[PDB]
Structures are given as structure tokens and as C-alpha cells.
Symmetry: D2
Subunit: 433 residues, 4 copies
């Protein structure tokens, strides 16, 4: 428990719109927080939900640019029902026509954040797949009298490079910090993860304590660090966190034990998404009796299946599936899948609306193709973004096993060997990718 309660003492600040290319092309026609997730959600639903389910109701979403789409989702899913909570988007730019780092994004709105009578700021990333009760995270921050509390966990040697690593004393206080080190520096960070609880067998298998990129910073400390101490810092992990320690500030670590995946990259995203189909039980479920992941109420009808053979898959709401075959895939909301289509190890983002039988009549008369997966199509190891018009006989098998290829003009982009059809893209029948 906490006192004062988190509701009135903790402010949530989500770092969403990274303004990068890591998830390109999923971020080509939309704000990063809006990227579709798990058949029925969007990235931003993960941190907003965890907050709400943690009794945190004052939330700000820091993103690159305003998006009518994003606001509409946030407004309809959260704004409606928070005695004074809120979920507000704070855009960095006045347009999508332009860079900026996390510490820069926070300093920009320091004048607004400091107006809140709160004891701490909860800083979350907007692209991690995980369930966490932030009250225990904050509880640890208050009991250790920490200036900054960094969430951490065991990390293997392969990924250790992509993270900020640390070393803690028996109290969990952070004694040594290093942002994405490598070489001698990376090996020098290897530590005994037995103090974390790891038996011994899997402790030498993960001799690293990696930062999860989320933090609890006491109000005045934040203002102090960003305005006075490091007015020139751009990133938290790379500059603010290391700087705070070097100054001798109380930097505490908090050990997380649940599931946790950063899905900021295409491959990671892809694997995480198909990860909800694994049996007997997936490492992460959006639904939880106690702490479920929320999303926008859509009142879509129950999915229709004409003649479908579905194995190891999850099906979103309001799908219209004909005589087809779906395997080890995630079928997004409002997905239309035609006759003879074959979907394998894929992620179908679905669609934003339904075309009418009349809409589909005009398209044909013009040689265009309807939203959805066309007849006798083969979709394999792909990410089909929203409203994609995939013509008949299209096959996305990437025969040659090409790893990368930027083909925006042809409607796709290949990354890590994954073919991602862009949003609203049309892919003519007969095309083979």
C-alpha cells in the first residue's frame, strides 16, 4: 500500500512518439502510440492500462505529433471515464513535417508537470509488452528514500548490449551504471544474479541486471536534474541516469519478475505478437481478471467464419472469414479473408472500417481491389497493416529469403526477413513477394 495514495500523489508520463525508424513502416502513416497490437489493441493501451490498474489516473502521453486518430482512441477509451483524472496527449511538434530525445521531451513540458501537486513522476516507455503493478514500484521508491528508482531485471548476454546495465548493493541501490556498453565494458558488468533470486543454473545464464527504461523520479529531483544539473541532456538512460549517480544521488533499482518484452523493433514486435498463440499458456495475456489491458469499446459483431481451418491462432473481433486456412497467426479486428487464402505465421492488423457490398462494386468496376486478403492468396511470415488491399493470387513467401528491402512504392518493406505490407496499400493480384 501507499500513502498518500498513487491517485493523487503520482503523475504518469508516457514516452510514446519516439519519432524514429525502428518500427518503420508501421509508424509511416501514424503516431507510434497508435500502432495496432494483439488483434484488438494499440501500443499506448499497455502503459495507460497498467497505470489505471495501478490506481494512477493522471496521465500524459508525450508524442511527436498530434493525431486525430490517437486522440479519438484515447478519448473514446479513457477520457470518457477519467474525481479528477485524465489521459492527455502532449505533442512535441506542431506538425509531422520535421532530433528530440526523451529528456528533451520531458523538459519541454516541465512547466506543466510541475504544476501538479504530486510527490513523484512515473516515466514509462510507450513500446513495451508487460503487466506491472506500479504501486509496488513506487512503494520501493518511497521506502528506500530514493531520488530515482529504475526498474530492472535479469538479462542474457546476447541482448545485454541493447540495454543500460547496472550493479547494485545489497539494498538494491545502484552503484554502477552503463548505457548499452560493449567490449571490455560489457563483460565487466557481468554480475552475480543470485542476489536477484536466480537459482544458480540460470544465474550464470543471465549475469546481467538491465534497466527496463522506466522510472519513478521524485518531483523536485526531476526539475533539478533537467533544468539545473543537466540542462543539456537529451536522453535519460544515456545521460540523466548516469549523471544522477555520478552526482551521488540516491539511485535505487527495483527488481521486476514478470514477463517483459521491448517491442520497439519489427522483429521483436512480430515475435511478441505471435507469442500470444503459444501453448499451453502464452508468456503474456492481455486479459487478466484483476489487471486487464483495456482498449476502445467498438461494439463490433461476433466474427463470422464461413469455412475456416484455424490452428494455433487468435481471432480479433468482428472478422469476416470465408473458406480459408489460418495457421499460427493473429487475425486483427474487422479482418476480411477471402476464399482459398492461406495465412501462416502472420500478423494481420485488420481494418478501420467495413466496406459495403456497394463499395466493393465500385472498386471492381475500376479494377481496384477491396480491403482484405484476396482469393487464393498466400501470406507467410508477414505483417499486413491496416486497410491493406491484397489482390487475388498474391503470395508473400519471400522465396529468396530477402532480409531487407525498402519498397514503399510497391506497398511493402522487408525487415529482418519479415514482409510488412504498408497501411492502406494496394498489392495487385498475381504479385509475388
Amino acid at each position: 500500500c501507499l500513502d498518500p495514495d498513487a491517485s493523487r500523489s503520482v503523475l504518469g508520463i508516457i514516452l510514446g512518439g519516439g519519432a524514429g525508424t525502428r518500427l518503420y513502416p508501421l509508424t509511416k502513416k501514424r503516431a507510434k502510440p497508435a500502432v495496432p497490437l494483439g488483434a484488438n489493441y494499440r501500443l499506448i493501451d499497455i502503459p495507460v492500462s497498467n497505470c489505471l490498474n495501478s490506481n494512477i489516473s493522471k496521465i500524459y502521453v508525450l508524442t511527436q505529433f498530434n493525431s486525430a486518430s490517437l486522440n479519438r482512441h484515447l478519448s473514446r477509451a479513457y477520457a470518457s471515464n477519467m474525481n479528477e483524472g485524465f489521459v492527455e496527449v502532449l505533442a512535441a511538434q506542431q506538425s509531422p513535417e520535421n532530433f528530440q530525445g526523451t529528456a528533451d521531451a520531458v523538459r519541454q513540458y516541465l512547466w506543466l508537470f510541475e504544476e501538479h501537486t504530486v510527490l513523484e513522476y512515473l516515466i514509462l516507455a510507450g513500446d513495451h509488452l508487460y503487466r506491472m503493478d506500479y504501486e509496488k514500484f513506487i512503494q520501493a521508491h518511497r521506502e528506500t528514500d530514493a531520488d530515482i528508482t529504475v526498474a530492472a531485471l535479469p538479462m542474457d548476454e546476447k541482448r545485454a548490449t541493447a540495454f543500460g546495465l547496472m550493479k547494485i548493493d545489497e539494498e538494491g541501490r545502484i552503484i554502477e551504471f552503463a548505457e548499452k556498453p560493449q567490449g571490455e565494458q560489457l563483460q565487466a558488468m557481468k554480475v552475480d544474479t543470485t542476489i536477484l533470486g536466480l537459482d544458480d543454473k540460470r544465474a550464470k545464464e543471465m549475469p546481467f541486471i538491465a534497466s527496463m527504461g522506466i522510472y519513478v523520479i521524485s518531483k523536485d529531483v526531476m526539475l533539478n536534474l533537467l533544468r539545473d544539473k543537466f540542462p543539456g541532456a537529451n536522453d535519460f538512460g544515456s545521460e540523466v541516469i548516469p549523471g544522477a549517480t555520478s552526482l551521488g544521488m540516491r539511485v535505487q533499482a527495483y527488481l521486476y519478475d514478470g514477463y517483459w518484452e521491448d517491442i520497439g523493433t519489427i522483429e521483436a514486435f512480430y515475435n511478441a505478437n505471435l507469442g500470444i498463440t503459444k501453448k499451453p499458456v502464452p508468456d503474456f495475456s492481455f486479459y487478466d481478471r484483476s489487471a486487464p489491458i483495456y482498449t476502445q469499446p467498438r461494439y463490433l459483431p461476433p466474427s463470422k467464419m464461413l469455412d475456416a481451418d484455424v490452428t494455433d491462432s487468435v481471432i480479433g473481433e468482428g472478422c469476416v472469414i470465408k473458406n480459408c486456412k489460418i495457421h499460427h497467426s493473429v487475425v486483427g479486428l474487422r479482418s476480411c479473408i477471402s476464399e482459398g487464402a492461406i495465412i501462416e505465421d502472420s500478423l494481420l492488423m485488420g481494418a478501420d472500417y467495413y466496406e459495403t457490398d456497394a463499395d466493393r462494386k465500385l472498386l471492381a468496376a475500376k479494377g481496384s481491389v477491396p480491403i482484405g486478403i484476396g482469393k487464393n492468396c498466400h501470406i507467410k511470415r508477414a505483417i499486413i497493416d491496416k486497410n491493406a488491399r491484397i489482390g487475388d493470387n498474391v503470395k508473400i513467401i519471400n522465396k529468396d529469403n530477402v532480409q531487407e528491402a525498402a519498397r514503399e512504392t510497391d506497398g511493402y518493406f522487408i525487415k529482418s526477413g519479415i514482409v510488412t505490407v504498408i497501411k492502406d496499400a494496394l498489392i495487385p493480384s498475381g504479385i509475388i513477394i
Copy 2:
């Protein structure tokens, strides 16, 4: 066009949710009729409450002879203007005593009287349909009617099952006939062109039926119930015709579109399976502008391990293993086990998920878990909420028994349809 004052401030919707629920038994066993599960993700009550909401009518009262915890939670969480239950009896038990619709409305007239409105929109809570009540209420105001009756056109074969009306050339209602036949059916012939129906269909459907939908001016309601007919029990069959008899202004208003009375098991069974109809369903719950609402449950997308789904609809948060599902409707949270074969059935689903912990206790005693057991076979059946059906169960009804009651056993049979009572436990190997 537009209503002025608007329906939001000048109209009061009053839904006749149901009596003892004698007609949809056992879907109503200890469950108020408005709470009965529908189309995988909804409840009956969602139909009239949605139509009101999409019609800019926000003040809604739901009258029901007995109350129900699920009805209150549903209305509470899904809506509430306001949406409130006005129960005749505050108990979840099925009343063994009779109360007619006129009685139901009479008892709470004093409450509806407290609302400053122009009309009361009276809706039956047993039909499947979509309707924008705005034009309906506008017509009522333009014709200066005291009562406006939604009229459904039909042919000679379907008409003997409704209360018909006879209109003059101005669409004014001048006579009623409750389920007429022979010479009285004929004397009810009407020229349907007068209400807007075209020639071919007018001659094909020369009878107009009331469909439990009415608009009644405030004062008229009070007068009819307290003064004119204080002993009337039935609103539609006694009070409306009574009003016409008094020379009151009762107008017809043509209703055009899909409409099904689903207050009886068989009709309920059919309509529910009608959403799987090919090429397209007669009634869709979803609609771009006027969708049917319900409670946001934040249920996860349905999981299917190895399912063969033919002409069916899958609700939300389902957990389907390897099985065959043909021409069926699968309600929310459903759990189908390995080897199950489901055909021509309506699965209500469940109200919650049994944790692995609960499944342990269950395993400890060898008890049956909620869901469809392994290798079961469900045919032409309705499976109410949280049913605990065991392995190798076979519900196929071989002797084609038509009517039958076996509450004790946990089921009923009406028109060949087997209905597994809610929370019912059907032991392993049982063959029905």
C-alpha cells in the same frame, strides 16, 4: 426531419421487459427476461435500449415483473439520461402470480408522471429489430394523435397470429381484432397503400398488425389507466382498443424492415442462428450509425488451437481446442474441449473464466469444469451460461422427442430443441 422539443428532453421510453417469463422458460429460470443472453455477445434488453439511444431517447425505464442481479449489473455497467429497472417484485425468483402489462405500467404511473415529457414511448422487450423512433414520434406530433401504433404489414397466413387493425383512408385506426380467423380475419382487410406500401406488396400483404410499439401522449396515458380503464390488465389488447372505442385519436404508422418476435424458444433459437445465414443475415447487430450496444468487457481475442469452423459466429474471449463447429453460435467466454462436435447449436458461453487454481480443485475431486467436454456432441440445442458438460456427453435427441421438461436433470425440450439450464451439470457419458 427534426423533433422540437427533441426526444432527449420530451420523450420517456418505457420498456415492457417481461412478466414471469413463462414463454422463454427455462432461459428465464431465475433470470428476468431482459437479461436473457442473445447473439453471443448481447442480452435481449440491449435491443430496445439501443434503439432508444440511437433515437436520441435517453430517459429509459425497464419494467419487469421480477428483478435480476445480472440485469442490474448489465444496465449499470453498459449504460446509465438514465436506464432504470422498475420491478414489480424485488426477488430473482420467477413469480407464480400474474401481472399484465397494463397493471405493470399502472403501478408506476405515479413515477412516470414526475418526468416533464410530452410522450411515453412504449416498447415490448421480446423482438429483434432496428428502428429510428424519431420519425415515428414526429408523425405522432404532426397528426396530433393521442396514440400512434407501429403497424406491420403481412399476408393472410401470418396475420392469424397478431392483433390486426383496420384503418380509414387517413391512416386513423378504427378497429382491432385479436388473432382473427375465418370471417373475422377477412373483415380486417386493408389497402396497405394508405401507409406507404407499394402495389404488389400491398395486395400481397393486405393486413396491418400492431407490434407492441406505441407513442402515447402523457395525459392520455394517465387518463386511460386511472380513469377510463382502471381494471384493464393488458395494455395492447385492452387499453389501446379501448381508447379507439372511446373515439380517441389512434393513428397507424407503417413499419418497414426486418422484425422477429423472439419470445418463444423456437423463434428465439431460429433468430439466433439466423445470424449465420448465407449469403447475408436478415438482421445485423452491428451497424455503422445505429449499432446494438452492450457491455464493454475487454475480453481477449478468441483462441483456436485446431478448430474446423463451418458457417458459424464466434463470440469474444473464447477458448476453442481441436474440434468441429458447424452452423452454430458461440457465446462469449466459451470453452470447447478436444474432440467436441457442435452443430446447429447456440452456446451461451460463460460469465467468467475458471482459474487454473479452480481447475485444480476440480481435478482434485474429478469434478466437471465449465465448458463443453471432450468428444461431446451437441446438436439442435441451446446451452445456457456456465454449463458444466462432461466428457463423452451426447445431446442429439434420437427419438426426436418434441416437448419435454426435466429441470431435475438439468434440461428442457421444446420443439425438438434441447436447452441445458444455466449452471447445469451434465455428467460424463450422459446421452440425451
Copy 3:
């Protein structure tokens, strides 16, 4: 520190309505929880607000009969929910009977305990500490206890605790060797010797925290015929050896069940320096319906010791030691002293106005050159010009319904919507 959370594990059940014959005629044409209070509130706001500020978001309000007005108030003002539960199907009993009736509904909620709030009382309390004490003592029923001296003590249902605070005996208005036998050591419940000695008696308040299974078992199996909670079920569960603990309540607590006590409590917000009870509070404000009423206007008012509610229209007049309710219109020359003006449910336009005058009627509000002293003016009262309500004869009681008023404890109370013709004197 509650775990699980109160909002998730506690169901609030407020017991109002119930006959309502002491506050007549304020309860004549309305539901009891809806009776106006302190210029801008209603009775029901006190318990609902204390619940909400105590993290208790699931609330049922039990009343005698439905009321669109009360619902409107609760709807517009307040996962969570605040639902009214009517006992009867028309406006034409025991506390446990009231609760029992909806057992079928209460039972369906997955809560550890039910918070029972009964009676009409002014007071701010944090039910979280009360629910904590109940949990820490692994009690079946925790009964809020009010400390008291021997003078008052002999007038209430006293309780006797033990070294552990566990209540072991009850007694309705005891005296002699029996009153002295109830006398306990309040220091045990948390009071300091000083106060504990001044008040060696503890009384029930009508506030209880009952565990879910317990109240279901107590009301359904154990005492299915019990009518009242405190007089039967609570004592009865103790004699059956159930852990019935007591929680010391040490704060403002004023009864407002009678016209005289209701009157004094409302005028009490004008108490010097700091009134005993303030409706506002930085942490636990008393909530109410947002009406978007305009700032109050005063053309020429001499106001002393009084509070003025929202959107009032006041011409030239004197207001003294009074509480002026929302939307209250006061005409020229009016003199108002020691009265509670409850205001109006709406405003009249000059259209409806210059249509009443020309119809021999009276517009809502206090008329020209009126005088109102020691009176309670219910909602929408139409008081004509020159009316004088002084009760010069100091009459104590008078049922003058037909004339739009009633006199109680020397206090004149003008019925809601009543029309007092101009010139009338009282």
C-alpha cells in the same frame, strides 16, 4: 492502508427513506435522502460523499420509494456506481428488513465487507481506518462507537467492551446498577484518560462493517425474523459468540432527525470563528450536483451572520443569521432573520411572472416587505407581498397543512410549493 483496496473490496449500503415522519413536512412531497441541506446540498450527500472520499466507489442507497428527482441528483452528481434501491413500488421498515430484501443483489458482489450507513447525521468520517480495525481484529462485525458521559449515556443503547474492545453486552437506555454496569474504560478504544473519564460510556452509532459471509448468514439463517440491525442482529451475533468489535469515533456528530435539530444544524454553519462542521474540506469535500448557476446578485443587501447559496437574486433587504438556499429570489423590503430558505428548483421568467400577477397568483420567492423569522421555507414557496411570519404568540405546534405550513418546536415550516397569500400573518 487497505489491501485489497476498499473500492474493490467494499460495498457501501446507505439506509435512508424509512418512514420519514419526524421531519414532516419536509418529507411530505419528497424522498427523505433528498431533503435539502445547507443551501446547496441534500441529506444523501453526506454519506455518499464520505464513502467516495473513503475510496468506497460501489454504493447502494436504500429508500422507501423511487424518485426521479433524487435519481437525477445522484445521477448528475456521481467499476463504481451509486444506485438507489426502492423498498416499495409506490409512495403510498426495519433496518435489517431493508437490507434483507436486497440480499440477492448485495450477495452477488465480490467484496470482503459491507459498510452499513444508517440514520441521518451530519459528520465527516474516513471509513478506511474503520474498515482496517475490522480487518486487523478479524472481527465478524465492527460497530462504530461514540463516547459519552453518564447524562447522555443513559439515553442511548450503550455497549460494554472488554480489555480487547470486543463488545460483550448491550443495553437500551439502562439505569441504576445496570447503567453503572455498562460503564467501560474508553482508553481501551483509544481515548486519553482525560476524555475517557469524562465519557466512561460508549454508544452504537448505526455504522457497521460486516463481513460478507457473516451478514448473509446472519440475516438469512441466524435471524430471519429480526427487524432492526442494532436492536437484534448485532446483539444476537454477540450472544452466539461472534467477534463483535467496537471502533471509537471521535469527531463532530450531529443528529438532524427532528425539525428542531435539523434547523439548528443548518443555522450552525453560521457559527462564529469556525463552525463545528464545514461542508467543504481540501481533502474530503461534500459533493453535490453541478448546476452551473450564476453568481448571486444583491441589489442592496445588509447581510450579517449568514451564508448565501448559488444563483440567488436579492434586491434591497436585510438577511440576518440565515441560510439562503440556491436560486432563492428575495424581493424589495424583505427582512429575513434566523431562517432557512431552501431556495427553488428553477427560475421563473418575467413572462410567467407578469402572468401570475395578472392571474391573482404569486411568483416564487419572498415577496416585498415580508418579514421571516425562526422559519424554514421549503422549495418553491410562493410568498406574497407583506406576509409576516413572526409567530408572535410563540405557538409551539400547529398542523396548518391546508394553509401551506406547519409549526414545530416553535419553528414555522412553509411546505414545498405552498402558496402564502399576500397580507397573511403567522
Copy 4:
């Protein structure tokens, strides 16, 4: 008759909340114009948003050159909890921008965002005018006449006319010419027959001119064409772009506006309009209305307390605490605290954002500081006291020398039109005579 599609899904509201607020300083010192306090219990932004909401317009953007914490909190609590009400700032800092930005530039910069909405027309509203209006009929007219732009028109006499941009129409209500603040001959060449709009003949003769009001309806496409293609360089919306459109033969129609309307964008006008709700007969403008009231944040403040107050021609906000004083022809904002012997005349008291506790007052008294509110024996005359001001005892804000203009920020006040304005949070020590 009503709009189809309804305003909610087809109309987008865009409020020009203000620029750097130089004309309303110091009420705009570190406070975007939209957040400026009004009528004891409201803020400027409440007028247009309420007019929108009461017109079935629920998608709303508020443009303001700079941002402010209070503006964000107010909209969040009063409206956030259907469409939205979002602030689109030009600079994400609460500091008053020292650079210029025109209204046309304001909108042009976010046209990409507006364009993302599926609406038919854009309703453009000034954010510093006091008036009540149902935008539905107005929008209805825009659609029936197939107009490209509809401008609400305000009839006025020769005297008042010179301060506004006047318009000339034909005999069918179409606008054919504009004159920005005309005089002499230019003014005379603008006279029109207001009857053409529906005005009364008698009134039409006393008011032969019609001014633009800063209220327009523009078809989505027309908007993009004008600011992107036709006039990519225009800075001012109502003075360059609209006349431009008319110049291009676009269908620019006038829509008569009857009723109360005051521009409260300068100190003097703002001041007069606020004190205008204290008229004995009938206030020309009422924040409250049976059908379309001005909304604001529900604050759950307690009834105002008055110890010994002689109040004449004044309005009193919510949660006030008043002792033995005299309040004449004034507006007293929420949470106001007025001490013993204070005389408040012809003044607008904005109130405070919170209450101080006795604990707080002892600490202030102990350190020789001043508590929020007006002090004992204070004389406040013809003044605007902004939020949380700390006026010490015996302070006299009377302006003995009748100074008309004076800037004295370091002293905590500005004088404009003989109106003293005490700056927000300003501390005016006891005995001080202004």
C-alpha cells in the same frame, strides 16, 4: 428543420483563443488569453466552448500562441470527461511570446490536423467576445445558400461602426466588399439597408452599418484552398483571407446576428463588460440560461459566508468569505476573502485559486507577509485584482492623480484607461497608496 448530417459529426469548431495577449496585459502575464478569469466563476474559453456544446458541436480545437497550465487543467476538468476540446499552441511554453503570429498563420499551421477530420465545415470563432449564440441556424444558412463562407454580421450605428471591419452586401444578402475600420468617405460608402438581413425597419435606419464579428463557417475544401493555394502568405484571417475570398468571386454570404455582443479583448472593454452583469433592471448578458448556459468547472466550493456585508449592485462568486465590509457595483470572484472595514467600489476581484489555512496565516503573520485577499481597511476603487493577490491592510487603490496609463510591473500593477490592475500573485504591502 435541423442540420443533416448533425453538427456533431460534420462540423469542427476552431477557436482562435488569442496570440501573445498584449492588449489584455497584465491579465495575460504568463496566462494564455483563453484562461483569463471572467464573471466571478468562469474563464474566457468558457464562452465559445459552451456556445459550441450548446449547438451540438462537440469536436473542438482551441488555438493559442502560447500555452498555460491553468488552461489545460480547466478544460480537462470542465470538459475532458461526444468529442473533445484540445489546445493547439504555437509555442509549448507558458511565457508570453515576443514574436508575432497572425490568425491565418495560426490555422494554416494546423491545417494538416484539421484536414484529418471528416467534417463538412469549420466553425471559426474568436475567443475573446462575450455573447450567447446557437450556431446551428447559422450553419444551416451556410448550407442552404451553398455559400463558401458565411459571416455573422453585426448591425451598428455610425458612431460604433468606425472601430470594426464593415461589410457591404447586395439586395440578396451576399457580401461584396469590406472596409477595415473605415472613416469619413470610406465609412459613408459602406451604409446598407439592414432590412435585407431581416432587421426591423425602425432599427435598420438607426444602424445602417454591418460589421464582421469574428464568427465564420467555412466549407472544408474552401478553407484549404484559401490558406494553401490562394493566399499562402496571408497573416490575418478575417481581414486578409475573407476579403480575399470575396475578391475571388467566392460565395461569401452574410448572416444577421441579433442580441448582446461585446468585444472584451482590451482592458477597458473587458472591465466594463464584467461590471455589466450588475445592472439593476436586467443584465444585457446572462451567463446562465435555461437552455444554453455557460458551463465551467464544477468546484464543490461551499456557500459564501458574509459576516457584516453591505452589498450594493454586485454579484458574488462561490466559496467567498466576507467580513465587515462594503461592496458596491463590483464583481467578487470565487474564493474571495475580504477583511474588516474593506470598501470595494466599481471593482472586479478575480478571487483566488485556493484557500489558505489558519496555519498558513500564522506563518505569514509571523514572517511579516500578507495573506491572500483584501486586507483590513482597504479601499479598492475602479480596479481589477487578479488571482491570489495579497493586499495588505490600509492599502488604498484609488488613483488620486487620475493617471490614465502607467506600467509598473515591479510594483505589481498596471493602469489602463484609469483602471488599476493588480497582477496575479502580486504582493501589495500595507499602507501603500495607488
